[PDB]
mmCIF file of C-alpha atoms in Angstrom:
data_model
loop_
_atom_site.group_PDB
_atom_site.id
_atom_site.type_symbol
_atom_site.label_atom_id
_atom_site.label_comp_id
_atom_site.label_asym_id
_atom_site.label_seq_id
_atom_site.Cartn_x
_atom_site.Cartn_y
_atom_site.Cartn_z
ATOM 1 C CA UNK A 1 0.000 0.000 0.000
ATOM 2 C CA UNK A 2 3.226 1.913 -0.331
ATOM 3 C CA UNK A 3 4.087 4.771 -2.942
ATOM 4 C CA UNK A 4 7.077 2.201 -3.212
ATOM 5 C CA UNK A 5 9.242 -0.605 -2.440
ATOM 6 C CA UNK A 6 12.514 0.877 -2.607
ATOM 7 C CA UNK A 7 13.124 3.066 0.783
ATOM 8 C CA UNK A 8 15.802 5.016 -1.144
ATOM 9 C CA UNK A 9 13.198 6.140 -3.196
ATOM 10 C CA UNK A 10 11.145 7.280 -0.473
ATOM 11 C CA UNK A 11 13.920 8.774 1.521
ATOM 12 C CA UNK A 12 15.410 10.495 -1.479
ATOM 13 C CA UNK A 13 12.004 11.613 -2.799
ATOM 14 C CA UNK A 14 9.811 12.462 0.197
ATOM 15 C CA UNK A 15 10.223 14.286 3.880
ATOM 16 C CA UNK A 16 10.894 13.002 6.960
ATOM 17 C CA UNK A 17 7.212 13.166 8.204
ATOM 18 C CA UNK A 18 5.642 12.069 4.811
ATOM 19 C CA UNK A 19 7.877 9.170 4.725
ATOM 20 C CA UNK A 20 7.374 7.872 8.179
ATOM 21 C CA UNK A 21 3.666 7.109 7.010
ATOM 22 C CA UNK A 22 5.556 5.235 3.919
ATOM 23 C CA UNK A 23 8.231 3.520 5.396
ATOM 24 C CA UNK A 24 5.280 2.170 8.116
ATOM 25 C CA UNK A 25 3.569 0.255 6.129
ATOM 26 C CA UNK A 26 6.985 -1.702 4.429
ATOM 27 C CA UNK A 27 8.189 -2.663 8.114
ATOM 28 C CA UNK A 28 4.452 -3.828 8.865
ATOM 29 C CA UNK A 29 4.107 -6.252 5.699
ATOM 30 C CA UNK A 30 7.598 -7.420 5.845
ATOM 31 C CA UNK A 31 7.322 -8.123 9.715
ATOM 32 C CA UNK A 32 4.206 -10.607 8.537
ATOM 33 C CA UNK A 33 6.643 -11.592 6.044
ATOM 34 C CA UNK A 34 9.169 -12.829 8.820
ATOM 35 C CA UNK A 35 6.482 -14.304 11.045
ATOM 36 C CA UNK A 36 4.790 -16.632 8.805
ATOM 37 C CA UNK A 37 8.414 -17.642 7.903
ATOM 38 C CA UNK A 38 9.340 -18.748 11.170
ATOM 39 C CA UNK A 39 6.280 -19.903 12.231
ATOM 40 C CA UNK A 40 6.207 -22.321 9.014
ATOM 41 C CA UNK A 41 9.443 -23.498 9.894
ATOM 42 C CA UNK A 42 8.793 -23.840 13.493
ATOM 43 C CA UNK A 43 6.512 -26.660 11.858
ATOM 44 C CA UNK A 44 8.576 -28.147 9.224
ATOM 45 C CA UNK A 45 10.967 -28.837 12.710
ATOM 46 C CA UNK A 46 8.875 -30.500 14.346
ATOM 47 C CA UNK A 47 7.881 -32.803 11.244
ATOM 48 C CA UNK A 48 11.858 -33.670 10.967
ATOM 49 C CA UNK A 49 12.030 -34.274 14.460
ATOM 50 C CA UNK B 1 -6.334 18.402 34.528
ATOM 51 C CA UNK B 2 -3.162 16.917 32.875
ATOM 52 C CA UNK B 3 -0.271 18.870 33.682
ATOM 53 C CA UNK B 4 3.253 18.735 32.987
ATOM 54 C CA UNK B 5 6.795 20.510 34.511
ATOM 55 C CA UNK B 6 8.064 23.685 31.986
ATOM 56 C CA UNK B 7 6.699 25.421 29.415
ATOM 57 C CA UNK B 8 8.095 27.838 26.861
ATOM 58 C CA UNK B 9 5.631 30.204 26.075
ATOM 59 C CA UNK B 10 6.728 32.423 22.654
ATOM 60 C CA UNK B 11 5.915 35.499 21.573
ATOM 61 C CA UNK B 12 6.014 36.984 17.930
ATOM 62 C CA UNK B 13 3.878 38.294 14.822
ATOM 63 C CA UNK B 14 3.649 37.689 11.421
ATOM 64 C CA UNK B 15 1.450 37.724 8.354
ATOM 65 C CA UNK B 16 -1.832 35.775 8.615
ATOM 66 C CA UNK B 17 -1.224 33.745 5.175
ATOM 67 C CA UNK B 18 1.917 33.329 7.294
ATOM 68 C CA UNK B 19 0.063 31.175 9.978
ATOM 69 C CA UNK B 20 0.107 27.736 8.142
ATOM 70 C CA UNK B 21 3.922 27.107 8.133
ATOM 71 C CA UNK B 22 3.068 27.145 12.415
ATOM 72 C CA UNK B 23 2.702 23.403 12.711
ATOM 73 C CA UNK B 24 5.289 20.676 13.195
ATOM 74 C CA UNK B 25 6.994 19.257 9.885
ATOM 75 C CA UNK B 26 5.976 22.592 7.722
ATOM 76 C CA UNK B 27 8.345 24.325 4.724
ATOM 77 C CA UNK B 28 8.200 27.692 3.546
ATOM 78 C CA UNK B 29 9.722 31.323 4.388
ATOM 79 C CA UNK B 30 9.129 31.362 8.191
ATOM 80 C CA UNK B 31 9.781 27.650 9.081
ATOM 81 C CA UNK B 32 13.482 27.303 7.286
ATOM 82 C CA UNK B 33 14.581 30.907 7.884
ATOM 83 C CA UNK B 34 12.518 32.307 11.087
ATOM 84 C CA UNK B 35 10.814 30.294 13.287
ATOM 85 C CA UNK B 36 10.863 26.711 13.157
ATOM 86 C CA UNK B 37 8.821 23.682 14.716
ATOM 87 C CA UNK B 38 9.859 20.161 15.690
ATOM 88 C CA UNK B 39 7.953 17.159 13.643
ATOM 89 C CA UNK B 40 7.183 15.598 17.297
ATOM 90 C CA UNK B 41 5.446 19.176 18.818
ATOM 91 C CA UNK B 42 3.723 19.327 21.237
ATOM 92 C CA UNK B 43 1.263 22.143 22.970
ATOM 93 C CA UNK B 44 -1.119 24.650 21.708
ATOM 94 C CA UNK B 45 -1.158 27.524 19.672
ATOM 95 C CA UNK B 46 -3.234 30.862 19.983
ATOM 96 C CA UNK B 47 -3.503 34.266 17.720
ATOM 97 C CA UNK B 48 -5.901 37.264 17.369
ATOM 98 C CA UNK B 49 -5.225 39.839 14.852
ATOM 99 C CA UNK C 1 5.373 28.696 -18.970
ATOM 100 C CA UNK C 2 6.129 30.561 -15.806
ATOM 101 C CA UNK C 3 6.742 33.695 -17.799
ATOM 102 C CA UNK C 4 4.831 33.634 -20.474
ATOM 103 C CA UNK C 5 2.576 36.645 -21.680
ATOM 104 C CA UNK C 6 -0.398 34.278 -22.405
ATOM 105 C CA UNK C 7 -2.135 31.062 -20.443
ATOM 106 C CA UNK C 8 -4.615 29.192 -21.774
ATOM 107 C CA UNK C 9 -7.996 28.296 -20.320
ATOM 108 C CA UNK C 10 -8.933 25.357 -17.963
ATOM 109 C CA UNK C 11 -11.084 24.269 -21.082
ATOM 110 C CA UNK C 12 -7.881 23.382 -22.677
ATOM 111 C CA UNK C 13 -4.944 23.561 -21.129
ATOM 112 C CA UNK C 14 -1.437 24.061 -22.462
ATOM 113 C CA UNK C 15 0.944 20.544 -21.799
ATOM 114 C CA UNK C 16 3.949 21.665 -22.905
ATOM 115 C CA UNK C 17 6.641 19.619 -22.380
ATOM 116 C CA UNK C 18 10.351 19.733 -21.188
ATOM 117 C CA UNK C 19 13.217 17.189 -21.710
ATOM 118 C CA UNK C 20 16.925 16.735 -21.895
ATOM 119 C CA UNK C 21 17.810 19.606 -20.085
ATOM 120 C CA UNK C 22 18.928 20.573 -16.576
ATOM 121 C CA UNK C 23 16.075 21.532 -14.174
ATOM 122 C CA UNK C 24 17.239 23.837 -11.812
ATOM 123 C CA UNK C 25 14.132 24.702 -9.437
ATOM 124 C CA UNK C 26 15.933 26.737 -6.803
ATOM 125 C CA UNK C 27 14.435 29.772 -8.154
ATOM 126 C CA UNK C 28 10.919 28.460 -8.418
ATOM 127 C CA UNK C 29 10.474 26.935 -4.783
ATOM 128 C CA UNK C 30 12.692 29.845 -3.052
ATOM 129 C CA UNK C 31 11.262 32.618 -5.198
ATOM 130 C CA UNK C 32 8.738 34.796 -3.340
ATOM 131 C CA UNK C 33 6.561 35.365 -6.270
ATOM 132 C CA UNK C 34 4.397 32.234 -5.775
ATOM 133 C CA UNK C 35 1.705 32.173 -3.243
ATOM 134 C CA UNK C 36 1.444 28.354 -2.889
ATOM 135 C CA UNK C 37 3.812 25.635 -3.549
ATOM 136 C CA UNK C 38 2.293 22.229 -3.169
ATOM 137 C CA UNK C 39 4.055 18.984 -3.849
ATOM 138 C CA UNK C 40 2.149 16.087 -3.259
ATOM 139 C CA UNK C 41 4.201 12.961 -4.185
ATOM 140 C CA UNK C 42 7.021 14.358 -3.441
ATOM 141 C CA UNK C 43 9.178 16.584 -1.315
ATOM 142 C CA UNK C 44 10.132 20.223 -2.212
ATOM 143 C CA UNK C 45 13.255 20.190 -1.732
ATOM 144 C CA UNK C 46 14.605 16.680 -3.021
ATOM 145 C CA UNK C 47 13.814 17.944 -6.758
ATOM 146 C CA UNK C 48 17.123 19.383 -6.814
#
């Protein structure tokens, strides 16, 4: 829901303030990213063990 | 109610067009040569003509 | 454009474009001839 994916491209295009509300929603989707990746895995452990 | 320790009540004049760049995170001829606001502010402003 | 004698009319407005050239807009944001400077998708100052 970002103007984009690249932060350089928000840092180097927008302000401070403006970017904040940017660079929000990138850490928000990617932290999803990270917990359905170690949850998953968290699984696939327990099948191996 | 609320209450806190300090406060740093200012005192100045300007246009009243000039009133819009007095808000945190603003950009014009007052806010990057005169009088300028942090992005995190915090307080209230007043003005009569 | 900035300049120019004659504007058109919100009925048809006048696109005119500008390439390969060197944009320097320090003396269109810092000029005080403009009473509003707005940039939406971007930041003022960056366009440097």
């Amino acid at each position: 829901g970002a103007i984009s994916s690249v932060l350089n491209d928000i840092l180097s295009r927008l302000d401070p303030p403006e970017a904040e509300v940017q660079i929000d929603r990138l850490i928000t989707g990617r932290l999803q990213s990270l917990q359905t990746y170690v949850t998953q895995q968290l699984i696939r452990a327990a099948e191996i063990r | 109610d609320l209450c806190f320790t300090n406060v740093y009540a200012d005192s100045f004049v300007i246009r009243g067009d000039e009133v819009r760049q007095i808000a945190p995170g603003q950009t014009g001829k007052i806010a990057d040569y005169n009088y300028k606001l942090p992005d995190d502010f915090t307080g209230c402003v007043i003005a009569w003509n | 454009v900035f300049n120019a004698t004659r504007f058109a009319s919100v009925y048809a407005w006048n696109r005119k474009r500008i390439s390969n050239c060197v944009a320097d807009y320090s003396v269109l944001y810092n000029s005080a001839s403009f009473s509003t400077f707005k940039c939406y998708g971007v930041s003022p100052t960056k366009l440097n």
